[PDB]
Amino acid sequence: SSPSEGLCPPGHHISEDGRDCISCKYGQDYSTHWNDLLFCLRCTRCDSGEVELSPCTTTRNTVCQCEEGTFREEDSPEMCRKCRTGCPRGMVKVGDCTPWSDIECVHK
């Protein structure tokens, strides 16, 4: 493929001299926007306590999700955490454990 206006389509990157658009390699690297990258970005590899929700394509990075019973949240993006198994004394559960949240307990 040929670089359009100095950029290459998602799923590729431009060569050193800038004459050709080289395809990223599926399963290893990707790019999601028209770019000038000399390298494609590397696919995330989900860790041990996560499951791959959708594999890495030359255009979209892998999507990882915490394993059942554990969750990840904005201030805790490094490691899946264990959900509480039940609500504190005399409180009610209004929200279940999901890979993006702990259980939610409220008051009377």
């Binding site: 926007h33 990258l37 993006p77 490094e78 490691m79 609500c87 409180m91």
Partner: protein, 151 residues
């Protein structure tokens, strides 16, 4: 005047992890300077392309009490990102720590420092992003961000 380096500090104040620190500023009274780089929306903007040793120290400090309806484990993470001529920020470095798990913990002091050499193009932007921004101590000697050309 041909020296390319910067060391900025602060005072207490969209596709990247954590929250970007934008309260950095240039002022001699806080031991911070800019030499052939400038600050913009908390981002160090590059002027000369080259190899840059980039670093940052973020001081996590808290006087904790085991709260009620929540877990207390904390993941203190510092991220150093770059904005290049690509829509999304690209992560250069990350460094993490977990808080002490003991129920006997009364407080936490966790200074995190990291650094590394990266090739940056003219107009590239670098920034620091952290989880738990509310626990960051911004005293200029405890938290800072900087870089220098390393050829």
């Amino acid at each position: 005047p041909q020296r390319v380096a910067a060391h900025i500090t602060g005072t207490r104040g969209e596709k990247a992890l954590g929250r970007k620190i934008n309260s950095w500023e240039s002022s001699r009274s806080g031991h911070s300077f800019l030499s052939n780089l400038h600050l913009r929306n908390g981002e160090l903007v590059i002027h000369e392309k080259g190899f840059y040793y980039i670093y940052s120290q973020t001081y996590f400090r808290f006087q904790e009490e085991i709260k009620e309806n929540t877990k207390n484990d904390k993941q203190m993470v510092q991220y150093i990102y770059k904005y290049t001529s690509y829509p999304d920020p690209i992560l250069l470095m990350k460094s993490a720590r977990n808080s002490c798990w003991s129920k006997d913990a009364e407080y936490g002091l966790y200074s995190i420092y990291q650094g590394g050499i990266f090739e940056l193009k003219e107009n590239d932007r670098i920034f620091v992003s952290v989880t738990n921004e509310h626990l960051i101590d911004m005293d200029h000697e405890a938290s800072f961000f900087g870089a220098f050309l390393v050829g």
